[PDB]
Design a protein around this ligand. Structure first.
Ligand SMILES: O=P(O)(O)OC[C@H]1O[C@](O)(CO)[C@@H](O)[C@@H]1O
Length: 346
């Protein structure tokens, strides 16, 4: 368990050093890839687009994203993985040998273990869902050429995300592969479970409560036993060079709370009374209606993302993050379409 992991870590460090030294004129592109792969874009830019066209795709997209993120946190907690930016400066493995230089970027101070890659998991799951849904829509309309093109695009996206994660020295190469495989598995599993559409608010509430209870109880039980699951928060602050790069939005509680909040918000929004009256005033099948809904949702959500909850106190930050992430599904399905109905169509 010792040598088998030390060899793998050394291989990862060597690969990161190679990528950083011999491909120096690509760093901005890799940063851009690592920025547009965050799940915030899957909850703010992709759900509004896919919900107004084949709503089932949007519902499946949100369910896959949320459950994949929760499984990612659980596996991160139970697997006890390292990261290749506090390892070279800490390990004793390089005694009697030169220390390979590694360059750190402002997007390379992550608080939390990285046994499965976080960006790769979500990207693989969401984009697999998107590609499969797009293929399923167009089957009725040289379809094999379309299959080839979309699968090539999806695999190119996955490979670019993997190289971006490795290049920044944020994760090891043996973690992005696991993330991609697990994301594909989760996407397939929720592809083959058609039992989440006709769901009442009670099921959504109970599911969110069960997930929250399991996470908190597991963490508290491990702490009571003696195991600390928040060891990485100490390491991230020390081995980060500039101390202003470590944030609080990339800690393994804000992500969980935001995922639970957006799940609860979607559940409340679907069962609301305003969603029932979508097909009133003006029929929802109109192409201009769908385009206007998409445009208004995107613009208002992008402007509303400018609000940042205060982080002086952690409990206030947590509650405000929950209440803020619970609104983004509630405003694109039940409020904006109602306003469009009441404004135009008469
Ligand atoms: O890909 P990494 O190294 O896990 O980065 C963390 C990512 O995973 C997450 O923890 C999501 O679970 C986010 O904080 C972030 O998007």
């Amino acid at each position: 368990m010792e040598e088998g992991m030390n060899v793998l870590h050394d291989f990862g460090i060597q690969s990161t050093h190679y990528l950083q030294v011999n491909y120096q004129d690509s760093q901005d592109w890799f940063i851009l890839v690592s920025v547009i792969a965050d799940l915030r874009n899957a909850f703010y830019v992709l759900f509004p687009i896919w919900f107004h066209l084949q709503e089932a795709v949007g519902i499946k997209l949100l369910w896959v994203a949320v459950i994949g993120d929760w499984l990612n946190l659980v596996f991160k907690w139970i697997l006890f993985g390292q990261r290749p930016y506090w390892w070279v400066l800490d390990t004793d493995y390089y005694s009697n040998t030169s220390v390979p230089l590694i360059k750190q970027f402002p997007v390379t101070c992550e608080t939390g273990p990285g046994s499965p890659s976080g960006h790769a998991m979500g990207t693989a799951g969401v984009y697999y869902v998107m590609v499969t849904s797009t293929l399923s829509i167009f089957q009725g309309k040289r379809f094999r050429c379309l299959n080839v093109i979309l699968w090539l695009g999806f695999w190119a996206v996955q490979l670019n995300v993997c190289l971006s994660r490795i290049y920044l020295a944020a994760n090891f190469p043996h973690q992005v592969v696991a993330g991609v495989l697990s994301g594909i598995a989760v996407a397939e599993t929720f592809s083959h479970i058609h039992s989440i559409y006709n769901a009442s608010l009670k099921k959504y509430f109970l599911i969110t409560f069960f997930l929250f209870s399991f996470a908190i109880g597991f963490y508290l039980l491990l702490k009571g036993l003696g195991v600390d699951l928040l060891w990485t928060l100490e390491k991230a602050q020390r081995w980060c060079e500039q101390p202003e790069w470590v944030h609080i939005d990339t800690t393994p509680f804000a992500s969980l709370l935001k995922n639970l909040g957006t799940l609860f918000g979607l559940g409340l929004a679907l069962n609301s009374s305003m969603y029932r009256e979508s097909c009133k005033g003006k029929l929802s099948k109109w192409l201009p209606f769908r385009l206007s809904s998409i445009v208004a949702s995107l613009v208002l959500l992008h402007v509303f993302d400018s609000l940042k909850p205060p982080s002086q106190v952690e409990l206030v930050f947590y509650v405000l993050s929950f209440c803020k992430s619970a609104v983004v599904p509630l405003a694109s399905v039940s409020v904006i379409p109602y306003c469009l109905a009441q404004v135009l169509g008469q």
